[PDB]
Design a protein around this ligand. Sequence first.
Ligand SMILES: C#CCOCCOCCNC(=O)CN(CCOCCOCCN(C)c1ccc2nc(-c3cc(C)c(=O)n(C)c3)n(CC3CCOCC3)c2c1)C(=O)c1ccc(C(=O)c2ccccc2)cc1
Length: 126
Amino acid sequence: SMNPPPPETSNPNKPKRQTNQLQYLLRVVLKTLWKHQFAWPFQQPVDAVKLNLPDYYKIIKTPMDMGTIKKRLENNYYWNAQECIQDFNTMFTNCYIYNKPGDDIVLMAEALEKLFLQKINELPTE
Ligand SMILES: C#CCOCCOCCNC(=O)CN(CCOCCOCCN(C)c1ccc2nc(-c3cc(C)c(=O)n(C)c3)n(CC3CCOCC3)c2c1)C(=O)c1ccc(C(=O)c2ccccc2)cc1
């Protein structure tokens, strides 16, 4: 099987804006998670071809990753903060749906998810 195309990271038709919450999602939330020692499985789309996972995109029909989220924030793809928060929660849920619960990557995702949730608790006023 081929990999599906990656998620869209830009759309000219979409209006753009710079909100204090969108700045925080990029320069605090993503900045913190990106540099974490456990980021690297989540920094790009799951390459099912390279990793030989013929069932990944039979199970995961809403793929998401931090490389996509990064590009979306850089390209003002997101109007509301909750759109971006929705993409992070999708990335975590996909990892928990596909991988056996005793797997190393499940602990890695939970660590990044704990940090994500602490940084979201500190999001600034709209
Ligand atoms: C022969 C032949 C070819 O030769 C290639 C050589 O490649 C190794 C060298 N790598 C580098 O130079 C770059 N790099 C970053 C990536 O490193 C992770 C190692 O695997 C990379 C590739 N994989 C397997 C690879 C790549 C991407 C993957 N994505 C997934 C995956 C799969 C599924 C099913 C999924 O749901 N998700 C979300 C992601 N996998 C599968 C593995 C994920 C982790 O558990 C094992 C399966 C990936 C595997 C690093 O050097 C590096 C390392 C480790 C850390 C690190 O974590 C650390 C640890 C301690 C202290 C400090 C830092 C940091 C940087």
